[model samples]
Target: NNFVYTDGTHFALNGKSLYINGFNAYWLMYIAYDPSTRIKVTNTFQQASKYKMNVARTWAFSHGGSRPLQSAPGVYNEQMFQGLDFVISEAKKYGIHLIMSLVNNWDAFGGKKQYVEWAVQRGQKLTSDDDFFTNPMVKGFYKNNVKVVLTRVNTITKVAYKDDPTILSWELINEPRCPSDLSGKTFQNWVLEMAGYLKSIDSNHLLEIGLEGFYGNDMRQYNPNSYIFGTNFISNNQVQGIDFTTIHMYPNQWLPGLTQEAQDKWASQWIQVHIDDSKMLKKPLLIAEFGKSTKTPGYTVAKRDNYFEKIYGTIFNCAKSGGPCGGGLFWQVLGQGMSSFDDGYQVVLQESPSTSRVILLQSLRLSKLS
Candidate 1:
């Protein structure tokens, strides 16, 4: 089945290292909900295949929205579930594996905030959405969400989500942060409990915490600008159930005061530090999300291409040297005619030929190693 597994410091498929070339399409299930707009989902996989990209990280949860995959606790919209089914089945047709994030830490599409709100309705006495990290009722809802997603059977493929080889991993949450608990112990405890519950239900797929690679606790000095999001990057991934480590980059947004050159240096250092830490933990690292946004006043395609080139170059060098650094998936990519969903970081390969070439070249380089 070619299910991906970790081998020491790298991802291995069929007993050899597998270097990933991936992109995020977080809106696939939302768009695929309607048959008329489903072509956009197919077009994304087609473009990814043509570009030689191998993995796609996407969202699996849409809770309590007007058009939500999950309507209430333990209740799901069947059509939305089928939309995700089509996404998984379509990716398989294009030779693309999936990394499905279970929930969001932020409020968009009913994230941790929604879960806490649900708990509040049931009289949980939670004062903050950050209570989603420590409140038992909210945690129970999240665990139920995990159980439901991991056991779903894809309507199109007739394969159980847990048993499907097309899915490379299941992320616990997207960019999880508990600012209310800067000590990081609160969020860390929650991650271990939820990750353990996920592993108990499904043992086939790899699991990740969907961290932004923030330093916490003793490693607080390693954080950019000395920021702490209450996630201990070093200790979190060392847990038994987490199959790999992930780091995300957004220096352009995080430190807009810096010149482009300084942003490049900060990014390089950010990536190297994580790679070195992954080596110490003996787990593979994926640059889960990183981008240079076009919304900036002086943005240009050439600048974006240069940023991508540098990031891919670092990954390639590390992989070639058998380092823990595996590969990266940029912030996002959208198919043609999906302008409404544009987030400035969106890469429509057709619109950016220079970026497309850079993507194809990286894929070619990684394919040789795999």
Candidate 2:
């Protein structure tokens, strides 16, 4: 049977609290830009097991390339698909669950190159009034893409690992949002619609909006008709249609040019937002994504490590204090760079053995959840 659990706070396996301690491993389904090296995507699952990680997040598509575009003239890259297949199989061997994301932040179907090409062919540009989320053509594209992915996964599971208990849940998308001009109503409607679509085909796994939070206070906006805003739609509205809620905490954004103490304070405030929202929504809160950058200026390895530990500790502590906090997934592992790529911004795990990955893993045990 599928592992499933749900309360006002979270959906978990049996009655045990779900603790997902892992990194966002993206390249399993798409090509990595770094030609010299790609994350040994297949091996990371075993590595995570060594660190006691129960879960890892990976993407179905990267938002920059068209080589493996799932919608148009392009077909799914067989090699990439095989790589992900291997990763999933390997994950089962390590007792790790997979949280597979269907999309990424750029709002690109696959990535920049493909998105641009597709949009141009449809006479839609990034600055155009055509709302890709609701456009029939775009909707069809999304549906087909989603169906292809689910169908493949379902078939694979049925044949090889239907009974395996390693898969965690199906995340509809990662940091899902639209261009600034797209209205919130369009975005929310798209999410609900897409979610419903996915549910129709796959009923064996749990479904999550992969949204940041609820609308209003949490999301900071009340009008879904305004520009698609992640904060508002998730924070203010009830999660009637979603299985659970997830949020990414980047406290540093709140006080951009501040001291370390200020950053920590911001982190606490960020965590509380999710806590309060969880209580109100009556859904389990997954800090699905949270991490501090080692690249942050002024902090030494020790200081950066302390920042991450304290931030996560604060969030977990609040959860223990009656907050409906379920668990969290760090932004990433292995991939690193200075590009506009969405994954580029959030890598917490570094190549090989490094202080960054070492400290991050150590901090997960600070709260003794394991």
Candidate 3:
């Protein structure tokens, strides 16, 4: 049982081109702190399986939370780690391959800032979380988290996660950013070192940098910022041991207008550019995250449905032509009774018949792709 890999523009699983249908459920481990609360994990997958969603991207990191995977640099919370163990095991039971990210960009559940604070307490002078990529003590802390997660034994499955086929890949960070150094060189070297170090420890699963599909020198128009926060898409994905490429798009947040038409236009340009570029590298690109929030004034189910269909349509059309577009997972999802968890992008597959139909159609269409 080998993890997924890229063969030209298609994902090769067991030597066969594999197309995926998946979702982003970052809260799986965060909310599964109790056995009873774990209904969130099982129910979410159970609902997703109805649409044949074959993959899921969830977090393995609880950076500085109440039940952080790593409470301190070398110390970890066993109960929380066990909570993660349960999520992975449940996902496997539902037949969903996991793309588990080790860190996050936002501080929802703690991220780079937590690492910097940890280093500061240990006598390292660091004012910004961007030092997460440069400071020696902070870098060592990040490396320790990487090794611990890649090699940690799943309490339920009794298999090292690094060797578990249920896990398709290991993401170095949720959406890596180094705003303190937007030249893209800092993150470029950081990704290289981390990717190499991870591959050295666990040679089984595919590794990704959790990049936000930003262009660098290759793109002449959007130079400097190039749709990126502080990292380079081309340089980061090109790192050794990095298997495939990823991008996250939120037109509601990046584009100028909140109108549906304008947002759609930005979405088209975003996916198309990445599709064209990933081909140059001969790696498949996954829209790891993309969505329009309900809070975006005038947002509606019809608008959300239209947005998803358009994005999935772009993926299908490009993929069928043998381009680098592989698949995509929407930004967020929630199960019934998890309403307070809504961050506007939450889609309950079991409840959204309109959106579910779109995914069902895509699953049927993608399955027929040789």
Q: Which ten residues in a row have the lowest lDDT in candidate 3?
A: 220-229
Residue 87 lDDT (model 3): 83
lDDT of 2 by residue, 166-205 (tens): 6567776666554543335556676667777877876567
Q: Is candidate 2 or candidate 3 better by lDDT?
A: 3
Score residue 360 of candidate 1 by CA lDDT. 96
TM-score of each: 0.97, 0.78, 0.95
lDDT of 1 by residue, 156-223 (tens): 98888999999999999999988888888998898889889999999999999999999975766556
**Models ranked on lDDT:** 1, 3, 2
Q: In candidate 3, which residue ranges exceed 4 Å CA deviation?
A: 217-228, 256-261
lDDT of 3 by residue, 1-370 (tens): 5677778878878888888778899888877777778887888888778888989898888744666777878898888888888888988898888999988777844588888888899899888888888999988988888889889998999998888898888888887777777678888888888899999998888887898777764572442224445677777777778888998887667655557676666667777878877887778899999887888766779988877888888889988887888898988888778898788898887778988888888888998886
Q: In order, what lDDT does every prediction score?
A: 0.89, 0.58, 0.82
Give lDDT for model 3.
0.82
- Name the better of 1 and 3 by TM-score: 1
Tell me how far the alpha carbon of residue 36 in candidate 1 is from the true structure, in angstroms, after superposition.
0.4
Task: Output the TM-score of candidate 3.
Answer: 0.95
TM-score, structure 2 vs. true: 0.78
